[PDB]
Amino acid sequence: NTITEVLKDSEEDYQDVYVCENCGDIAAQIKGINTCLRCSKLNLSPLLTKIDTTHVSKVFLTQMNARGVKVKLDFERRPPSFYKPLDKVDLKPSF
Amino acid sequence: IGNHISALKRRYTRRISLFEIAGIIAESYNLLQRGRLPLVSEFSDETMKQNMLHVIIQEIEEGSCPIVIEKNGELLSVNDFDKDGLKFHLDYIIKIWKLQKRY
Amino acid sequence: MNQYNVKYLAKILCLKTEIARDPYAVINRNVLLRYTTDIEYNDLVTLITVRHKIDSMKTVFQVFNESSINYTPVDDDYGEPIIITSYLQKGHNKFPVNFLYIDVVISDLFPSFVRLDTTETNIVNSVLQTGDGKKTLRLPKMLETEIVVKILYRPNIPLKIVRFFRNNMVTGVEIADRSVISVA
Amino acid sequence: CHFFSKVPNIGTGYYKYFIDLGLLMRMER
Amino acid sequence: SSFVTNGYLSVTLEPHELTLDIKTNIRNAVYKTYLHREISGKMAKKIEIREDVELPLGEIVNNSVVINVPCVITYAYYHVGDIVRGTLNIEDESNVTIQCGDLICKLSRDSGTVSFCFFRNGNAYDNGSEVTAVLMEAQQGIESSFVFLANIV
Ligand SMILES: [Zn+2]
Numbered sequence: 001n002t003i004t005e006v007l008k009d010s011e012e013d014y015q016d017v018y019v020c021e022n023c024g025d026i027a028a029q030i031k032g033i034n035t036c037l038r039c040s041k042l043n044l045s046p047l048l049t050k051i052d053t054t055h056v057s058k059v060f061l062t063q064m065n066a067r068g069v070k071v072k073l074d075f076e077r078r079p080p081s082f083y084k085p086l087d088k089v090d091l092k093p094s095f
Numbered sequence: 096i097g098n099h100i101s102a103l104k105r106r107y108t109r110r111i112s113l114f115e116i117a118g119i120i121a122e123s124y125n126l127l128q129r130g131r132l133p134l135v136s137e138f139s140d141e142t143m144k145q146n147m148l149h150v151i152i153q154e155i156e157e158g159s160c161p162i163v164i165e166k167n168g169e170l171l172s173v174n175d176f177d178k179d180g181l182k183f184h185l186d187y188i189i190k191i192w193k194l195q196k197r198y
Numbered sequence: 199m200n201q202y203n204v205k206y207l208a209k210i211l212c213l214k215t216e217i218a219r220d221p222y223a224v225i226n227r228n229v230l231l232r233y234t235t236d237i238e239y240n241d242l243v244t245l246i247t248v249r250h251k252i253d254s255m256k257t258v259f260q261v262f263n264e265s266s267i268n269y270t271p272v273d274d275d276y277g278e279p280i281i282i283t284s285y286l287q288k289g290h291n292k293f294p295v296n297f298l299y300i301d302v303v304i305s306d307l308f309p310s311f312v313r314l315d316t317t318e319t320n321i322v323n324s325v326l327q328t329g330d331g332k333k334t335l336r337l338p339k340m341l342e343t344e345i346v347v348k349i350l351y352r353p354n355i356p357l358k359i360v361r362f363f364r365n366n367m368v369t370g371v372e373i374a375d376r377s378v379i380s381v382a
Numbered sequence: 383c384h385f386f387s388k389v390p391n392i393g394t395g396y397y398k399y400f401i402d403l404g405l406l407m408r409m410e411r
Numbered sequence: 412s413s414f415v416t417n418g419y420l421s422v423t424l425e426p427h428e429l430t431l432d433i434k435t436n437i438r439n440a441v442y443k444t445y446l447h448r449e450i451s452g453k454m455a456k457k458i459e460i461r462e463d464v465e466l467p468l469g470e471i472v473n474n475s476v477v478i479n480v481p482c483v484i485t486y487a488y489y490h491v492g493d494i495v496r497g498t499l500n501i502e503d504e505s506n507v508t509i510q511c512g513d514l515i516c517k518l519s520r521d522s523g524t525v526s527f528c529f530f531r532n533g534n535a536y537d538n539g540s541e542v543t544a545v546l547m548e549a550q551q552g553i554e555s556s557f558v559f560l561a562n563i564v
Contacts, residue, residue, distance in 0.1 A: 001121060004389045033553055045452065045551060052473065053387050080419060080467030080479040083163055083170050083402055089109040091177040096317060100324040108329070118394040122471060126401070129474060130427035134405060163400040163468055168330030170468070172402070400468040401476055403433065407466065411431045 009054050017058075022046035024065075024072045026058065049075055108167045111176040116184050119162045119173050123151050134159040148198055152185070199263045199282050201239050203298035207261065208235045208246045210293070210303060211280065213349050215248050215257050218276075221352050224363075226310035227303060242266065246280075264292075286343055288381065290351035297345060310363040313350050314375075319359060322375060337377040347378060413456070413487040419467075419479040420445055420458075426474065441480055447513070449552035454513065457485035489514065489546060489557055494564060496543045499536050501528035509544055509561070515553070516544045516561035523563075532563050 018027040020036035027036045027048045034048045051073075061071050124147065127133065133150050135142060136157060142150070154160045160173045173181070192198040212233040213225050223229075232252070238245040244261040258272055261280045269279040278291050286294045302308060314322065326335045337359065340346070350357060359375055366372040389395040420441055428436040438460060445455050461481045470477040489495075497511035504525045509516035523532035530536040548560040 001389065001394060004387070007384055008387050035551065040551065057385060081170065082465060082467055083172070086171065086175045089106055089177065091106070091109060092179065096320050097324040100321060104329060114393050115397065118397060118399065121394065122399050125474065126426045126429070131429040132406065132431065159405060161402045161405065163402050165398045165400070168328065170400070399471050401471055403466055403469055406429065406433055409431060
């Protein structure tokens with residue numbers, strides 16, 4: 001956690017940023033509505049999801065997109081989990 | 096013979112080290128600092144005049160710690176680990192905290 | 199095939215005899231203490247007779263060059279010709295000349311190895327699982343063409359895991375395992 | 383993990399943490 | 412034109428909301444993030460919280476908690492060819508719309524005219540008049556309402 005927080009942007013510089021799960025573009029905000037221009041132009045309705053990354057990461061990915069490389073991100077949708085009681089274990093020796 | 100090894104490994108899962116207890120304390124302390132509700136017994140207006148670390152240790156000891164940890168494909172509360180190891184690590188941690196003026 | 203590398207191969211054709219007798223024996227230098235060998239050299243067919251001291255049982259190997267192979271079973275024959283080849287190739291009875299430039303078995307770098315039986319295999323497989331569903335770890339790899347695999351070969355027992363007793367400077371002996379991957 | 387601002391699977395981060403809301407929802411004002 | 416399902420809705424809570432007002436916060440968040448929004452071509456017109464099944468564990472992410480609330484969802488949707496009726500609305504010379512209970516119909520430019528507002532598609536329609544239309548093409552919804560390019564019936 002220490003290094004994770006050291007390498008991150010200051011918590012006071014947070015803001016809401018959305019990403020299109022289809023092409024990886026940072027969704028723009030037009031009239032208060034989140035919209036991916038590229039996918040809207042193609043008559044698609046992709047999911048927009050919130051991310052929390054550093055600014056330099058966005059700069060790097062955009063510059064990589066300039067050279068022609070498309071970078072796409074998926075997100076984890078693990079099914080829900082439930083806690084179950086567990087029997088006791090001793091672990092001491094027989095002395 | 097696979098069942099025997101599976102049982103031995105399940106028992107092995109219950110041992111506790113510094114990393115796990117430190118992580119549990121970190122999660123509980125962060126959530127409490129940012130404003131959740133303490134789950135101690137006899138909660139009252141006097142509970143807010145104590146030290147938050149005393150509150151966390153009390154919650155752990157009386158079995159009302161909400162943090163659940165996943166170790167080897169299972170989900171364990173802080174009370175499912177071996178009790179003696181929990182006492183061992185907590186004693187060490189409380190000593191060093193007292194040296195730091197936290198406890 | 200010359201007059202020297204046959205004396206190196208006669209030692210490998212005692213570990214092979216041991217494995218023929220007992221497929222679950224541990225193989226290392228010391229096995230040679232239980233066998234004796236007699237060699238009759240020739241430029242066409244070489245004869246190697248291996249004898250087990252206690253049992254007094256004989257095994258006769260016929261060694262040919264790759265180019266010229268004229269094999270006919272004889273008394274107490276091992277049942278399959280031994281072939282010395284120019285390069286490394288698949289087959290438990292084919293040995294490259296690269297393997298026979300020195301006396302291999304008695305070097306300090308020759309391994310100590312064994313084949314696991316079914317119970318030990320089940321124990322290893324169970325130990326490898328991560329406990330989270332069916333996800334499992336993998337043992338490191340070793341090619342199918344190694345001399346170790348050639349020595350450990352039985353026609354009706356596929357070989358999947360090999361156990362090594364490593365020399366360890368601080369604990370004496372250590373145990374490791376490897377998985378055999380095919381070569382095309 | 384460093385690229386995407388995630389917690390490395392090292393030390394304290396080697397495990398995954400949840401919060402059990404069962405007890406909290408069993409309390410009534 | 413609608414159906415009902417049982418499913419989990421994911422939601423995010425802050426630590427300061429983990430108090431005795433937990434159920435209220437869960438309900439408010441679920442409504443705020445799924446009440447009248449169109450997602451994947453469908454809308455969730457009515458949401459019921461089970462209140463009778465075990466709640467799954469919550470996942471701690473950075474400084475927030477993620478919860479899968481079980482619910483029974485009443486989904487509604489529209490397709491091309493449906494006939495709807497709604498109040499006409501004109502904001503400028505180029506933007507003319509029809510407002511319904513949960514549907515918005517957009518009229519193509521080469522269908523009528525705006526003058527004064529009033530609309531002339533062969534008949535005079537006053538600003539706020541009720542007109543019938545048929546959906547032709549779909550788009551992305553806005554401010555919790557369906558959007559469709561439609562022509563006046
Ligand atoms: Zn897109």
